Design a protein around this ligand. Structure first.
Ligand SMILES: *[B@@]1([O])O[C]([C][N]S(=O)(=O)N2[C][C][C][C]2)C2=[C][C]=[C][C]=C21
Length: 271
């Protein structure tokens, strides 16, 4: 507690102007100081689970030395909406590593469902998260059904705090072996979908990797990231949003603004 919210930030005004709820957890991994706002509330994961999915595949590859190189063929029936990479390889197949990169860096839905199948489905990914000490995360459904973002529904949700804690374990801690850890970091660094979210608050001369989520309803969207400010320890953070009405729109600008407030609350001079 002593190092949580040392400096208050106007998250309440931000979410009120947005018309919904914003949840933020940010950890300075050097000092342990944190910024926390609605951090233990549940928010829909949307596509943000795909980062943890790729980490779970990497963990399995530590015991299967050839998993990542395995070529996966799939039929047209596997190609659900928003599969920008896997649709270009329908007639050829893709490797497990390539599907993992596509799921992370393009939020590819067909790739995500194929990898979920490899792990034993939503319960298998949930089990991986339990194995690293995350008791909050739950995945319940497949793409696209997991995006329903129904108010009060705990299916396919986690909390900003648990997302940040798990992301820290996987990218900076010991939950993955060192080669797999760096591969997960590199996939996050290569994400293409997050330029208007946490990255928009991060100076260009700092390294950053992220994974976005966008449910398409209930103003529900999110991003989590690891950030390496130069000259100090990395920061891990999660920013999740939702709103009360099905037709409410999400806002990338609100996510970027919340990330700025988190960095400011941690005293990390940047944006
Ligand atoms: B999941 O949240 O990420 C993808 C991409 N989302 S999006 O809002 O960036 N998008 C670009 C235009 C169409 C969708 C996705 C796609 C569908 C369902 C869930 C997710």
């Amino acid at each position: 507690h002593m190092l949580t919210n040392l400096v208050a930030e106007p998250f309440a005004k931000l979410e009120q102007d947005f018309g919904g709820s914003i949840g933020v957890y940010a950890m300075d991994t050097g000092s342990g100081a944190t910024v926390s706002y609605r951090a233990e509330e549940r928010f829909p994961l949307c596509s943000s689970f795909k980062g943890f999915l790729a980490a779970a595949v990497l963990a399995r590859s530590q015991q299967q030395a050839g998993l990542l190189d395995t070529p996966i063929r799939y039929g047209k029936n596997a190609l659900v909406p928003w599969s920008p990479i896997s649709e270009k390889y329908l007639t050829t197949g893709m490797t497990v590593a390539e599907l993992s990169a596509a799921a992370v860096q393009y939020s590819d839905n067909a790739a995500a469902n194929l990898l979920l199948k490899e792990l034993g489905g939503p319960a298998g990914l949930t089990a991986f998260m339990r194995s690293i000490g995350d008791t909050t995360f739950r995945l319940d459904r497949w793409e696209l059904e997991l995006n329903s973002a129904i108010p009060g529904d705990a299916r396919d949700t986690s909390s900003p705090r648990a997302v940040t804690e798990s992301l820290q374990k996987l990218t900076l801690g010991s939950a993955l072996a060192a080669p797999q850890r760096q591969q997960f970091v590199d996939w996050l660094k290569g994400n293409t979908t997050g330029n208007h979210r946490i990255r928009a608050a991060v100076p260009a001369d700092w390294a950053v990797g992220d994974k976005t989520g966008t449910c398409g309803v209930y103003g529900t969207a999110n991003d989590y990231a690891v950030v390496w400010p130069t000259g100090r320890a990395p920061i891990v953070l999660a920013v999740y949003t939702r709103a009360p009405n099905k037709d409410d729109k999400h806002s990338e600008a609100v996510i970027a603004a919340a990330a700025r407030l988190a960095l400011e609350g941690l005293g990390v001079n940047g944006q």
